[PDB]
Design a protein around this nucleic acid. Structure first.
Ligand SMILES: Nc1ncnc2c1ncn2[C@@H]1O[C@H](CSCC[C@H](N)C(=O)O)[C@@H](O)[C@H]1O
Length: 352
DNA sequence: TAAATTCAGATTAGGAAT
DNA sequence: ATTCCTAATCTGAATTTA
């Protein structure tokens, strides 16, 4: 059984001890192509064992993004990239809550000892929650400090819903612009393109932490001086593309497969607003992307140097009450579609 | 009718005491 | 091997707004 590492630093995170400069990966796992898989770390029993079983028995690298930004984010990363001489994109996001939220020290209570936020999710705290916290602390405004049972209801609910102090006895969740900044995207990366505020929360909560992924993909820069052809599966708002761009790694071609029309609009907007000289090809449903289509694309552009993607965590996340049924769930089973497309690439890149 | 609102527990792990 | 707590957690869907 996979035992999650404590601390969850993977092979090493910046400013922390325990950096592992070399690993030995099995023969069946070697590139080309380099590939990068991502999913949540806190899955039902025996999910990552199955994920590793279908990805050449590579032990997953579990890294909590609280070492890269202000919000925690526990994910597993299966990849065949070299782990030596990584680097972070500069400047790194704000580490603590005091720095990430300058105006919060005006309203933050002394008994809220949080210096770090929990995971950014797709479901945000409601306004009726902020009121129940406001009413709970109201009868103690003239007192220097509310009693203990009043404190830990507020404390536990702030941790439960990732609330920051925005007003007098007012604990509200994060705004989309704050989630963008914490997850490592530029400001207004998901604002336009027909994306409603409701949709912004969902696709942001589903996305990468760009600094964590960029720290991992950083080793690709000396290997490909002339750019890479990228096969992006489950693109979303383009976490991997933003990471590659911040690494100054030219993207000659990005074939993106993302079923959300608003997410594809976000990516195309990001493509033009950055003046990317390369070509962006956009596919929608991965279940209709045939193996011969991949072979035809690889023949035109000359194979993919990197296959990056993160399969749905619908049926793996602890927040899911309805359908947390594991890897065989309706959405998370698309992980085997990732293995299908990846296997086609390997057939041409390495053989057999 | 797109957008916004609201609330709906369980499954893990780990620590610590039997 | 049990019992008992703290603790985190890329969510679904019914319903109402507008
Ligand atoms: N059948 C399907 N075909 C292609 N993409 C799909 C799909 N079903 C779900 N997806 C997409 O897979 C994505 C997984 S969330 C991952 C998003 C990405 N890692 C990022 O950085 O933003 C979701 O955005 C979802 O839109």
């Amino acid at each position: 059984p996979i035992r999650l590492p404590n601390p969850m630093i993977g092979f090493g995170v910046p400013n922390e001890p325990g950096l592992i400069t070399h690993r030995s990966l099995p023969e069946l796992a070697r590139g080309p192509p380099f590939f990068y898989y991502e999913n949540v770390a806190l899955t039902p029993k025996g999910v990552w064992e199955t994920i590793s079983r279908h990805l050449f028995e590579i032990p997953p690298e579990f890294v909590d993004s609280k070492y890269f930004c202000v919000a925690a984010r526990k994910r597993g990363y299966i990849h065949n990239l070299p782990i030596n001489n990584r680097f972070q994109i500069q400047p790194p996001p704000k580490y603590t809550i005091h720095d990430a939220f300058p105006l919060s020290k005006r309203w933050w209570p002394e008994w809220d000892k949080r210096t770090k936020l929990n995971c950014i999710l797709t479901c945000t705290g409601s306004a009726q929650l902020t009121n129940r916290i406001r009413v709970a602390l109201e009868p103690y405004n003239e007192e220097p400090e509310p009693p203990k049972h009043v404190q830990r209801y507020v404390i536990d609910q702030c941790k439960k819903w990732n609330l920051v102090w925005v007003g007098k006895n007012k604990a509200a969740p994060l705004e989309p612009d704050e989630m963008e900044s914490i997850l490592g995207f530029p400001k207004n990366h998901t604002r336009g393109g027909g994306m409603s505020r409701t949709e912004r929360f969902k696709s942001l909560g589903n996305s990468f932490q760009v600094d964590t992924v960029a720290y991992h993909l950083s080793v690709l820069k000396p290997i490909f001086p002339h750019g890479i052809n990228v096969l992006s599966l489950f693109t979303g708002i383009g976490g991997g593309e933003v990471a590659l761009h911040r690494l100054q790694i030219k993207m000659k071609l990005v074939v993106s497969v993302e079923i959300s029309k608003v997410n594809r609009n976000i990516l195309k907007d990001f493509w033009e607003q950055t003046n990317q000289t390369g070509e962006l090809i956009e596919f929608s449903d991965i279940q209709h992307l045939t193996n011969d289509t991949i072979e035809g694309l690889m023949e035109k552009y000359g194979g993919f140097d990197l296959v990056i993607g993160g399969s749905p965590c619908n049926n793996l996340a602890g927040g899911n009450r309805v359908s947390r049924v594991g890897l065989e769930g309706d959405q998370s089973s698309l992980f085997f579609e990732y293995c299908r497309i990846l296997e086609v690439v390997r057939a041409r890149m390495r053989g057999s």
